[PDB]
Design a binder for this molecule. Sequence first.
Ligand SMILES: Nc1ncnc2c1ncn2[C@@H]1O[C@H](CSCC[C@H](N)C(=O)O)[C@@H](O)[C@H]1O
Lengths: 265, 265
Amino acid sequence: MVLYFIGLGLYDERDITVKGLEIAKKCDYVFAEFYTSLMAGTTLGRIQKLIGKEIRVLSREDVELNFEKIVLPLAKENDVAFLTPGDPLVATTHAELRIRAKRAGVESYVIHAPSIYSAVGITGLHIYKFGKSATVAYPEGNWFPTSYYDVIKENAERGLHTLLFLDIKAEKRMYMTANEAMELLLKVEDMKKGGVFTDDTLVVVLARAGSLNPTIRAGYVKDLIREDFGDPPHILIVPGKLHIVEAEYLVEIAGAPREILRVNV
Amino acid sequence: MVLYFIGLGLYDERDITVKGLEIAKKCDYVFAEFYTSLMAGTTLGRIQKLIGKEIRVLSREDVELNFEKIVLPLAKENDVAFLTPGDPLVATTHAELRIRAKRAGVESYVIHAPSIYSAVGITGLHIYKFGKSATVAYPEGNWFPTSYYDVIKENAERGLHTLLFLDIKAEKRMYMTANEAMELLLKVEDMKKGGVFTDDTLVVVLARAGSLNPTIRAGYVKDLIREDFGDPPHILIVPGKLHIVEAEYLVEIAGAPREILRVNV
Ligand SMILES: Nc1ncnc2c1ncn2[C@@H]1O[C@H](CSCC[C@H](N)C(=O)O)[C@@H](O)[C@H]1O
């Protein structure tokens, strides 16, 4: 009778909310997609074991083109769940699927889960200070995406931090590292020369949020661009002007150069 | 020797993650704070029964002034949990507590949970389009703060959405309603005349996010200002120019008038 969109969280199968788990366990059919993000600390098997249900994984094509043919038909006479990494409606286009559900006469409900969008709070940067977000996409052929550079410029001008989601090519098992994102940004900088992203720019890297020991590092691009931040997923952040407490946390917790403690007010 | 910052999530006792629950259950001591926000869909008793541990609630003073006197001494020789509504470290004052832990020679780990910051994705508005966030504070005496109005102005002129956290008197457990926020914003507009918030402004109200039955409503201030959005908590969003997909979700899912499809896109 219903369709549930349930987030699985940041890193492993235990990042699902108790609410989401109890609801999933009682659903008749369970579908899921693992192309919008990477849960580096679990496997399909462990997720299936926790929920006690077989999980039918769908590809991007299955979802975007055939969601109404694969999932919705069952939701008309059964309780169906659609699982996704992190929060199902953050930096995905899954919200549109609720419209398809409605038009198909299917009621849908959303169960949230920890998202990287809010988890960056662990970097010590004030969440309210984050401005517009952007995605660093892999260049393809003659096409080299650069909109994310303008976003950083716009936020920085306002003293706001910029969250940069990094690209993912699930089927090819490609996960953009913070290092690759920094390299692309330097290239865009040489092209636009806006002084937005250089070797002297302070950046923050958060890798495998959700795990108990995520990698949290802050420093200048010149020093971090070749640093090993561990396995993906990674997210890159370009902070705006720092408040004293933000700088203190980056130094004490993220190993940033003590010199950033001296904010230029 | 270990302190766990564990998020309780959005609304009720089941919004904690499985990871958070299992870790909390094994902790020797469990503390909690309910001053950064509240858990409107549950009670201390229900949270205690779920975790199966006595929970010592701490006031803002207990934490800000005495975190190292009350919590850290126990964390030095035991496993201690510190529960917070939402996702830990979204609240600005949380981060610094990890530095206190470090100074006391205590290891700390963060267990994330859903935050309203990311849960607003259920409004159908693209997460990347949210700019700087702000809090609408109740005016009192001769004090009439209005910085949140400027935040909306700066975001909107850049085509970005503005997430407005509404004031809460945690201690007294009194919540500002979206209606009161709209009244205040109209009040501020009449004083600043910036043309930022008027009867013709399109707003989105999200009430009781996390619940299976949150109220999601979109429409013009003139129509929503006296509407009943149900019990707290309420969140108010002033969207910037909309992508057609965002507008269609607001119409189909949030009952927005068809007019937004031609006026706000
Ligand atoms: N645990 C994690 N650690 C670091 N980055 C993460 C992450 N989970 C997701 N990301 C980042 O976000 C991108 C996916 S965007 C989809 C996000 C998801 N709906 C959520 O709510 O988190 C990844 O390519 C990566 O850059």
